[PDB]
Design a protein around this ligand. Structure first.
Ligand code: 2J5
Lengths: 243, 256
């Protein structure tokens, strides 16, 4: 019958793939600023997800064609033996788009590759996108970017996680990494293997939104609060218990 | 514990105020002819269903039928400016058609950000740190009716309203996501609202609210239309979603 506490079956041979697309620099014609600190984010995410059982694959500064090719490749292999799929974007963005090295890519194109009829072996399984992307400004310094990327939904069993909501600001420390990724990774490390994942994301919401912007080193950044959000199309409770 | 102090993985919104709070329902069944929008038969079932479920959870429910945009704005501004100091939370429901960042009132559209903006920070100080929950059943009205002055059937409308976020401690709940379709039975009401209300009744007073919304996601996305009744509705799946800016666990336990 109908089960109020039903969980995604996470008893497969493998947890699954976690893809990370990391962008630090951009083709000069795009006139986008470098993203110092993003490599800290990449490393942090890599440890957390690998500790959760994911097979983590990182890609640095791919051109759009290369990026599309790689994600299409992954969408077309069998995930039959996997619990789930994770995809992380660390870049600048605008509207429905995230930037690769040389051009933008639509988020809907990326998520569309993992919808039911495109990726049968992921049907009914969690498909999690984590997006750290905002408006590029055209030792440890905090850079502040206006929210620009739409907090888009996707298909059933997708979970779309965004560093920042409309009207707020994304922060990135050049040594320590992004506020959002730091707090996400801290929560993953402590609670990732026990807490329901949207419960955990809610903790991240609290952590990030409570960071004070009262007295920034850069006075221009005062009052520029960060509020993350996630859009859930999940249909069951999601845990990452040790396999 | 003996007394608490640190970062708590299981922190819950404090729901021990004198009152649960206000639940606003804006119910729109018909529209000014110049808008060229179809009527929304079944929405009154949705309104009544929601009224019962939220009142059982302790909310003070106020319904408004077919308000003009100016009246709507006035009313919600009125609620945003009173003191919610004695309240746990705030709920606002829109039952209408919509487009992009807009929801239709009787005579004009209103931007969702205009509505949520009224309840941010010191615009509504007494709701700061409290759940502010918007539930939006709004999609694209099928316009095969004229620009002139004018049984249980399932109407199927394309998703049209952006699944917009808002401020901290907002929870924005949407009947349908981009690329899918919202369904409304002309007697029984909307798929989304029916399933939301059933889950509220069975689990609302114990389940964490986003967990409950996740149940609604499952219920709705698994619904099929009777192939013989409307073949055109084949492949028009409904996938709801919610955008959470919540910072704590939200329960509606019976108030003492
Ligand atoms: C068009 C849209 C679709 C879904 C969600 N939000 C959308 N627009 C609002 C918006 C603007 C800037 C940054 C984030 C953000 O969410």
């Amino acid at each position: 019958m109908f089960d109020p506490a039903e969980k995604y079956k996470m008893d497969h041979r493998r947890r699954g793939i976690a893809l990370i697309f990391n962008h630090e620099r951009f083709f000069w014609h795009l006139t986008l600023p470098e993203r110092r600190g993003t490599c800290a984010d990449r490393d942090n995410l890599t440890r957390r997800f690998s500790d959760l059982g994911f097979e983590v694959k990182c890609f640095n500064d791919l051109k759009a064609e290369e990026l599309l090719l790689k994600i299409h490749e992954v969408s077309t292999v069998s995930h039959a033996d996997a619990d789930c799929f994770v995809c992380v974007f660390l870049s600048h963005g605008e509207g429905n788009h995230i930037y690769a090295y040389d051009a933008k890519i639509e988020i809907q194109t990326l998520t569309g590759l993992f919808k039911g009829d495109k990726c049968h072996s992921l049907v009914g399984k969690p498909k999690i996108f984590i997006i750290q992307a905002a408006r590029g400004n055209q030792t440890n310094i905090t850079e502040v970017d206006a929210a620009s990327v739409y907090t888009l939904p996707a298909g059933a069993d997708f979970l779309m996680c965004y560093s920042v909501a409309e009207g707020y600001y994304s922060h990135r420390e050049t040594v320590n990494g992004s506020w959002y990724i730091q707090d996400l990774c801290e929560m993953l490390g402590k609670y990732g293997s026990s807490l329901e994942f949207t419960e955990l994301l809610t903790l991240v919401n609290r952590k990030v939104s409570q960071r004070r912007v009262d007295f920034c080193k850069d006075p221009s950044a005062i009052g520029k609060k960060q509020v993350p959000c996630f859009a859930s199309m999940l249909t069951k409770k999601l845990h990452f218990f040790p396999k």
